[PDB]
Design a protein around this ligand. Structure first.
Ligand code: NA
Length: 178
């Protein structure tokens, strides 16, 4: 191989179920919670989390979306990417609510920073928490996940690839060199 599998299909499901239980334990229930996915894959994970939480607790948790594209300022291969928020769609008011941002992979933190800015443009949440499927390290901003599916040690020359059915017809997270 040129890649290694760091979360297989069963492990992604197990991670999400653990995250769902952790959100319930931390918030003592889900009363005023709202899940907001970052980018297409984060939006799909948020919907999966909302489905699990509904199975556990029998209350529906609303799910919204923040659409973001990351750009480099140059022609090089820097992880230092600058986010642009392209759109939002959250179906409920977030003021005085507990918003849980959902990110597929936490790396630099720069996408999560943009997500937080976008939320504050829309309302005044009492809290913003962060759930991530993979934390690969190498923060460039002082950002930490509240809920982590799997910690995956990485170097900056490695890339994480996330496949989910809804987007690839398969669920898998892999790591490659280069
Ligand atoms: Na993504």
């Amino acid at each position: 191989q040129e890649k290694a599998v760091v979360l297989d299909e069963q492990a992604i499901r197990r991670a999400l179920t653990r995250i769902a239980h952790e959100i319930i334990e931390r918030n003592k229930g889900v009363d005023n919670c709202v899940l907001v996915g970052i980018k297409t894959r984060g939006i799909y994970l948020a919907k999966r989390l909302a489905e699990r939480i509904e199975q556990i607790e029998g209350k529906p948790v609303p799910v919204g979306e923040i659409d973001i594209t990351l750009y480099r300022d140059d022609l090089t291969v820097t992880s230092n990417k600058e986010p642009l928020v392209k759109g939002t769609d959250i179906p409920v008011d977030i003021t005085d609510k507990k918003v849980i941002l959902v990110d597929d992979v936490l790396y630099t933190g720069r996408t999560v920073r943009a997500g937080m800015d976008a939320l504050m443009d829309l309302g005044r949440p009492s809290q913003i928490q962060l759930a991530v499927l993979v934390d690969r390290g190498h923060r460039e901003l002082p950002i930490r996940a509240d809920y982590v599916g799997k910690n995956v040690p990485t170097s900056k020359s490695e890339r994480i690839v996330v496949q989910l059915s809804e987007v690839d017809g398969q669920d898998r997270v892999s790591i490659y060199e280069k």
